[PDB]
């Protein structure tokens, strides 16, 4: 197990434009196209990212290609972030994966609001961090996924994904 398998489980795979849980157009493995309500807008964004006239449909290879780019960008975002980097650097690999999943789902902006939790993470206070993270819109909106990620943060193992 690695970050890629993990996120593939959490996000699934759809080759056609679809609305995610918040109702934003998305495609592939969690690739958000746009938050605007125009499907055209979306299609336009899609074509821009793929480099062709997709007509709202992509292949599996294309989806995986967007996915590689997206994972990479998320890691890089963490490293470039002054408050996150040190937390991330302080943790083992499994827990790092958990943080990348959060940033991938909610962006640097959303993750940005887990300060308190990140403090406890840095201090290796797992149980507490886990409890603090559950107090969030994130957990209330997408509880099953949140739970998986929280257990992974808490335990440092992949048990939630087995
Ligand atoms: Cl893109
Ligand atoms: Cl969920």
UniProtKB/Swiss-Prot annotation:
It is an enzyme of class 3 (hydrolase). Induction: Expressed late in the viral replication. Pfam families: Phage_lysozyme (PF00959). Its main location: host cell. Changing residue 11 to A/F/H/M/N: Complete loss of enzymatic activity. One of its GO terms (biological process) is defense response to bacterium. Its EC number is 3.2.1.17. The keyword Hydrolase applies. Transmembrane segments: none annotated. It catalyses: Hydrolysis of (1->4)-beta-linkages between N-acetylmuramic acid and N-acetyl-D-glucosamine residues in a peptidoglycan and between N-acetyl-D-glucosamine residues in chitodextrins. Signal peptide: none annotated. Substrate binds at residues 32, 104, 117, 132. The keyword Hydrolase applies. It is found in: Host cytoplasm. Optimum pH is 7.3. Changing residue 132 to M/F: 2-fold decrease in enzymatic activity. Keywords: Antimicrobial, Bacteriolytic enzyme, Cytolysis, Glycosidase, Host cell lysis by virus, Host cytoplasm, Hydrolase, Viral release from host cell. One of its GO terms (molecular function) is lysozyme activity. The active site is at 11 (proton donor/acceptor), 20 (proton donor/acceptor). Endolysin with lysozyme activity that degrades host peptidoglycans and participates with the holin and spanin proteins in the sequential events which lead to the programmed host cell lysis releasing the mature viral particles. Once the holin has permeabilized the host cell membrane, the endolysin can reach the periplasm and break down the peptidoglycan layer. Belongs to the glycosyl hydrolase 24 family. This is Endolysin. It comes from Enterobacteria phage T4.
